[PDB]
Design a protein around this ligand. Structure first.
Ligand SMILES: COc1ccc([C@H]2Sc3ccccc3N(CCN(C)C)C(=O)[C@H]2OC(C)=O)cc1
Ligand SMILES: Nc1nc2c(ncn2[C@@H]2O[C@@H]3COP(=O)(O)O[C@H]3[C@H]2O)c(=O)[nH]1
Ligand SMILES: Nc1nc2c(ncn2[C@@H]2O[C@@H]3COP(=O)(O)O[C@H]3[C@H]2O)c(=O)[nH]1
Ligand SMILES: Nc1nc2c(ncn2[C@@H]2O[C@@H]3COP(=O)(O)O[C@H]3[C@H]2O)c(=O)[nH]1
Ligand SMILES: Nc1nc2c(ncn2[C@@H]2O[C@@H]3COP(=O)(O)O[C@H]3[C@H]2O)c(=O)[nH]1
Lengths: 454, 418, 454, 450
């Protein structure tokens, strides 16, 4: 039994170990500083600490169970996994997190939870879970905001705990800066203690916030330290959010830069106004339907097998309906379907006119086309998705009466997304299948003899 | 070291760090002695001793460290004293070094001692180049600049207060970094000009802090953002065309494996930014031994091997992926750079006839077919993730037309074998 | 009858539904928290709520009546549009938003106008309108910053209402943090109530510590939560403004980076200072006259049909003026238009000299050329817009003298934009036109013997 | 005479018109709000505003005389320039800015300077001057910081004037928020009024209200609006400074990103440590000596004509020193100058070995190359700047012992930057010249015997 890191069970365990790690990171210092928090809920804290220790041991067991990739293969041997875990610094951090330091409760009293700070050494598991679910979540920006909010909450809570500890060390009510006297009817409550300390740390991590000024030099040093810690933390948070906004606006900024560059080119080259209305309408269509990026730049890093698989799963049922590519080898279908490059045509666009070069075969993946006359007013026949034309224009057929020429006018009725296969692309794909080359030549021969174009 | 090179041999970096500490002393401890009274007659000897130690470090850097620096002239490394001394003398670095040791009880006489800032920039560049994740040091450096700005503001506030007590003025400096209210109210135009100047300098420091943090976050997550955007574009493309979840999950798993293993998602787009000599020498130190191990390419010209090394494309195959099916056309030579590959035999496949580890080459006989002559005689699958370097037959055809003797010899090998 | 979602009528209706959505999103919580606002203007608020509900019904009717692009064509079938609308989360949000909760008044009196909080669920219309506005306005950054400011105003208004409601729940005048006693003649006014709540909310989100300090634990908790909300608000504003600033001078920063790369190249290669001045003046001309766009880089973002139709709208009118291209095939002229490559020449620049290789012909679009002698100061003739030269140097005429050589000295009087048709591009476009190729050779040689050559 | 907008005199006039525009955008509102300021220096302001309007009229005349590049040339016909000016919105703005509203002083009195708020409509000229300064100064970031600071001070001053106007409308000394009673001798001074208003505006915008709290509802509204204006100001300053930081260090960030990418590639591909250190040393040399971006990448943004003039200036002087190319025609020489492409070589890199095919000729521009045979450390001869090798192999000499093959090993002791010319690029450049091709073949053929 080996849990792979790229699976979902590893994710569920990462959450289930993050919960005690988050509990430790947010509660050990809280019980260490606020003595009433430790003392009053002693049994609950003991139960939660025992649960966290049990989950820590189970996570150490999982670290042995989890399998790394060796030569691109998952390791399932127990000894190799144990050695790989023990060689890393993570094993040292895990074993340091689980010193039997709860036995110092007898040697230091129940009011010293600072002995359990070693459980904070499992921070790396929490960060691993957070970085794993940042990529997993559908909303990366929302969870990154959640992480930033949780980080500043943890830092503010830690500063609150340290402020309460320093007020305890200096003395409650000794200065107007420290936490007030805990003998007060309203300020002696633990809830008031923690919440007012949280408010003070909120006011102190930002220099803007106004707080009772420090009296002695130790308070001034601590306030300056909090000032610079808050400078670092909140500058990091604002930089993170600014980077998020730059990332989410990067696509819009690139698209608007392209649109403005094309506008500048059309104004510079004195393009007619109707044509620039057509261009701007096309760009508004592209942004409305979220088709700003072409698939050439989308499937550019994928391997040939994966691009091939996507190309089969998109176009095989459409391409096998063609008469010439009916009785063809599947390898040629795989090689040809990779070369189908898309073109999107606006409504009223002439894909090809009579008197044009036939060097591309157009396959209607989406949209409706029409065979029209020279004027274009009337429509001869409509074509829908799954259709094809230009099958014989790309085929080099000798003696054709209407060779390498469009015999009909094709008009895009709507926004037609159709894939073209170039003649040179198909001939370069046919240098590997000469038998299929002459098979397609024979098919074109019978097609032209059927309509009498020889 | 009779002549240290400024780039490598990190003992020079250690000495430059010592010079940076001396310059940081001359930057930080001068205003706190000019404003605050720690320059008492009781401990004046300590301040003078450390200041003279910093001056000795400056003079030592001028004499016996900056002079013996290897320097490039016309692209050639030059390592002789009579030329290194003149090259250092002609540089602006020696001019600033001379200006930083002008001798003029007032610590403002040591104000030009802070003028050796080029040593700090050189040490910053060297520490950036030495260690990976240099954004951490950039964060530390920007924080040091902001602490120095607050330190200067604290010293100025203490000097203007007479017209511990250091941490109090520092607290007032941080409190009034982006706040003007803490400062006393102005009754003149001149006073509000300085108050606005103080506010603007503090906001400049705070915004440099924020902008450098934004820069560090953007640079440290630029690759992650690019990979996430590429993955999301691919997922949106597959969802638009209604790709089933099997192929989508295969594409995804390829994306995480390529991002975790390679870390760039495309090695070829990095190579085109390198010099061609860099590309060639990197292709040699990766695949030249493995390519030269095969007997089909032995006896061939070395430049033909070098040209095929540039055109070898790295492709990652998922677990249980058919690299080449039985009866499929053969037009590629697969070089297993990493991973396990299995050639299958027995009844109806599914039995590993032979397994091949990293560094082996198979399918080279498919490179020599003309007009799709070669067919894959056995099923081949990828046991686990594997990185194979692939050379297309068409790419070999474009390479072979530049080497007629090599092409003729390889065609003789084709005729002899098949 | 169908409405086009990309049309201006749909944008107008987007505004006409954004107005009730914005009215709800502000005034519903404003009336819910300020009871004197709901009670005093109840006659106006009921009328405005009924008007907003009527516009919500008409928005449902429009969203049934609006069409989408199925096969590139807008759907005109009513039942298909209705089933598309119903099988969507937007229909669920709209029907939840339009559940009549005004009957709950009869259960709770007129003092509870938060019963119609479901009308806030039409936020998608507001977000769609404010996303469809930036993509059609001439001021994207100005509208973006105004939209961000209005969002911050809405959040500040909401937090003001929440603060007033919290003060109401705690009790007015109980302590310093809450709103003071409403029985006071000055602070009991509704306008004063709202504007002091707005003043408190702005001091609590945009800054910290300038409000009166809290007293009880819920008030400190609210102040800390509002600090987190306000620091997220501040980081969002900073990130949006920083991305906006980087995007406005993205072209300027990129151009300055290219200028600096050029400048360091010419410093490293040690070129003459006169060439340095010419390069700097060229870049100044390029930036000043809005010519910094790279024509190939701009046109590679267009579809092949759309880029070709741009080029037809640009070059076909002046390529017909060419003597050999005056009577040619339309496809040949279009393909030769697509092969035209732009060049820009400084004033005084020599395009070609007597003896240089006549490899490409040049078609003048913008600028005036000069035919000069060996000295270069004497003027023979000036070539104006639409002129052309070197049209015979790219033709392989057999036996003609001065083969592929320039017979004149051409210089640029001012800045000139010329599109050059190369010999190689002409041969590449002519490889599908043998009859047009030999007829072009016939026309060129008939020109040549007309002038006494060959 | 027609003034060139790209010239320095257009910049000079831009400054001399920006000074009255910056005067009107800052001082007119101060005169309008501080009535004591208008009454105290009415004699100064009358002539100063008159000469500002005179400079506005002269700027309109310059706008009629400024040229625009019509059809690639600066047009000098006055009628076309006047029509181009009048067809633009700038003429409407200048006409509305030059409305003689100073003639209304006789009706509303001398205590209303706000009537000439139309003089702010020349703001486009000031913005044009600033955007021309941004593309002219040698410190664009320092100018951007100064311009942002000036804009923030202008907004602060305008808000101070608006605050004083609000205090005047409510009444001085009516409550603690407004400006105190002007009958007080300490708070009645004109300088003290302006300084206190300016400081109140600075506290309200920058510190988000350290000022005493508002008393009236209109004061609360004004303070909230100023809070929004101030948080927009602070966010604008922070975002502008962050964008400036990104613009300054974008080149360093890209270079370090490519260093990190190549380091990850070498660590992932198990590249040997000596090669890795050589690569980092090479990139450090590239960054240190300011030769980072490739020559083709740098010059690909340039037009072909200007890039040709740049390349001729760099490589043609070293190309006529070549034995075969010394006595050839100029057109083939410049074509070979444009065809040759750079190659950088680290120390210890062999440019070509013995028995290698001579695909390209190498001409060294900045290098200290050596010729070594077999052993690799013989150093038969050292070629310094201006030398070349491989010219024998590119020429298809009729009869050669080493047909299209190198004759010796070539090594680089240090970093060398040398230009290569492929045999295919020479053959394609020699198709257009038959006589020069024959001359090159004959001259190359008669040199192989020695
Ligand atoms: C110098 O130490 C400091 C450390 C933290 C800060 C905070 S205070 C705050 C609180 C709520 C909303 C917004 C803010 N504001 C803007 C306040 N005014 C200038 C408009 C900040 O700048 C915050 O900082 C960040 C980087 O978010 C300030 C100073
Ligand atoms: N001429 C003609 N072409 C048709 C018709 N129906 C479909 N087509 C297709 O339209 C295509 C236009 O380009 P081609 O002439 O290459 O091939 C044509 C046929 O494939 C028809 O009825 N007449
Ligand atoms: N058929 C077969 N192929 C093997 C064996 N061992 C390695 N291979 C390689 O697997 C390859 C599959 O494709 P090829 O037929 O082109 O070439 C084959 C050989 O290169 C083996 O034992 N049998
Ligand atoms: N010599 C000369 N050339 C002219 C004149 N008018 C137009 N030209 C054109 O200038 C061109 C320069 O290049 P070519 O020699 O190819 O062809 C030349 C002619 O087409 C003229 O008056 N004299
Ligand atoms: N064989 C030889 N070639 C040298 C020597 N010094 C310089 N060279 C040049 O190095 C060149 C390498 O390419 P070639 O063989 O074409 O021509 C060679 C000579 O021009 C030398 O000492 N011996």
């Amino acid at each position: 039994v080996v849990i792979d890191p790229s699976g979902n069970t590893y994710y569920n365990w990462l959450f289930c170990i993050t919960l005690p790690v988050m509990y430790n990171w947010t509660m050990v210092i809280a019980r260490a500083c606020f003595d009433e928090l430790q003392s009053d809920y002693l049994e609950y804290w003991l139960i939660l600490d025992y649960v966290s220790d049990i989950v820590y041991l189970i996570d150490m067991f999982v670290r042995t169970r989890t399998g790394y990739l060796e030569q691109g293969l998952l390791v399932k041997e127990e000894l190799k996994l144990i050695n790989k875990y023990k060689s890393n610094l993570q094993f040292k951090l895990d074993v340091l997190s689980l010193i039997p330091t709860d036995l110092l409760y007898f040697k230091l009293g129940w009011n010293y939870p600072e002995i359990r700070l070693n459980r904070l050494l499992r921070f790396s598991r929490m960060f691993e879970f957070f970085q794993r679910t940042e990529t997993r979540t559908n909303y990366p920006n929302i969870f990154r905001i959640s992480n930033l909010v949780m980080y500043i909450v943890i830092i503010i809570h830690w500063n609150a705990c340290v402020f309460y500890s320093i007020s305890k060390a200096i003395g409650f009510g000794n200065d107007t800066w420290v936490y007030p006297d805990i003998n007060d009817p309203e300020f002696g409550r633990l809830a008031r203690k923690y919440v007012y300390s949280l408010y003070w740390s909120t006011l102190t991590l930002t220099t803007i916030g106004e707080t009772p000024p420090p009296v002695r030099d130790s308070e001034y040093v601590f306030v300056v330290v909090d000032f610079l810690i808050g400078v670092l933390i909140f500058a990091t948070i604002v930089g993170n959010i600014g980077s998020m906004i730059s990332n989410m606006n990067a696509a819009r900024a690139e698209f608007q830069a392209r649109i403005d560059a094309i506008k500048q080119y059309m104004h510079f080259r004195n393009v007619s106004k109707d044509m620039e209305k057509r261009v701007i309408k096309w760009f508004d269509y592209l942004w409305t339907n979220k088709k700003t990026v072409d698939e050439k730049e989308v499937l550019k890093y994928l391997p040939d097998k994966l691009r091939a698989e996507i190309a089969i799963n998109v176009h095989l049922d459409t391409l096998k309906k063609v008469r010439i590519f009916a009785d063809c080898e599947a390898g040629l279908l795989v090689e040809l379907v990779l070369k189908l490059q898309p073109q999107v045509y606006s409504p009223g666009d002439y894909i090809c006119k009579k008197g044009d070069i036939g060097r591309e075969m157009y396959i209607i993946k989406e949209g409706k086309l029409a065979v029209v006359a020279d004027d274009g007013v009337t429509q001869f026949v409509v074509l829908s998705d799954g259709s094809y034309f230009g099958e014989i224009s790309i085929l080099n057929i000798k003696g054709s009466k209407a060779g390498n020429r469009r015999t009909a006018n094709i008009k895009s009725i709507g926004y037609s997304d159709l894939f073209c296969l170039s003649k040179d692309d198909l001939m370069e794909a046919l240098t590997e299948y000469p038998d299929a080359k002459t098979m397609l030549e024979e098919k074109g021969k019978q097609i032209l003899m059927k309509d009498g174009l020889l | 070291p009779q002549s240290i090179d400024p780039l490598t041999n990190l003992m020079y970096v250690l000495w430059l760090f010592f010079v940076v500490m001396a310059w940081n002393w001359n930057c930080w401890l001068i205003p706190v002695r000019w404003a605050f009274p720690y320059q008492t007659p009781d401990n004046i000897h300590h301040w003078l001793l450390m200041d003279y130690l910093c001056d000795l470090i400056y003079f030592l850097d001028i004499t016996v460290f900056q002079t013996r620096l290897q320097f490039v002239r016309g692209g050639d490394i030059i390592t002789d004293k009579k030329d290194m001394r003149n090259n250092y003398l002609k540089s602006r670095r020696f001019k600033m070094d001379l200006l930083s040791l002008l001798p003029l009880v007032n610590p403002l006489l040591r104000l030009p001692r802070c003028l050796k800032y080029m040593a700090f920039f050189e040490f910053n560049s060297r520490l950036e180049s030495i260690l990976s994740k240099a954004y951490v040091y950039r964060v530390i450096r920007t924080t040091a600049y902001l602490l120095y700005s607050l330190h200067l503001n604290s010293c100025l506030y203490y000097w203007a207060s007479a017209y511990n007590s250091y941490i109090r003025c520092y607290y007032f400096a941080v409190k009034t970094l982006i706040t003007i209210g803490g400062l006393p109210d102005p009754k003149t135009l001149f006073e509000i000009v300085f108050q606005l100047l103080n506010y603007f300098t503090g906001v400049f420091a705070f915004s440099v802090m924020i902008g450098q943090m934004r820069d560090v976050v953007g640079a440290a997550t630029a690759g992650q953002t690019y990979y996430r955007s590429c993955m999301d574009s691919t997922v949106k493309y597959m969802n638009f065309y209604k790709i089933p979840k099997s192929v989508q999950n295969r594409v995804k798993t390829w994306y995480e494996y390529t991002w975790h293993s390679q870390g760039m998602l495309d090695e070829s787009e990095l190579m085109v930014q390198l010099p061609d000599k860099m590309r060639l020498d990197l292709a040699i130190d990766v695949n030249y031994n493995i390519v030269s191990k095969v007997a089909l390419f032995q006896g061939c010209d070395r430049q033909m091997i070098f040209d095929m090394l540039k055109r070898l494309r790295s492709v990652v195959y998922l677990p249980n992926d058919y690299v080449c099916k039985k009866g499929e056309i053969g037009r590629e030579m697969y070089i297993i750079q990493a991973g396990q590959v299995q050639v299958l035999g027995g009844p109806d496949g599914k039995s590993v006839l032979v397994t091949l580890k990293a560094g082996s080459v198979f399918g080279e006989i498919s490179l020599l077919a003309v007009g799709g002559g070669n067919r894959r005689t056995a099923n081949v699958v990828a046991h686990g993730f594997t990185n194979l370097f692939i050379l297309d037959k068409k790419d070999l055809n474009e390479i072979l037309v530049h080497y007629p003797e090599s092409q003729k010899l390889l065609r003789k090998k084709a005729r002899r074998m098949l």
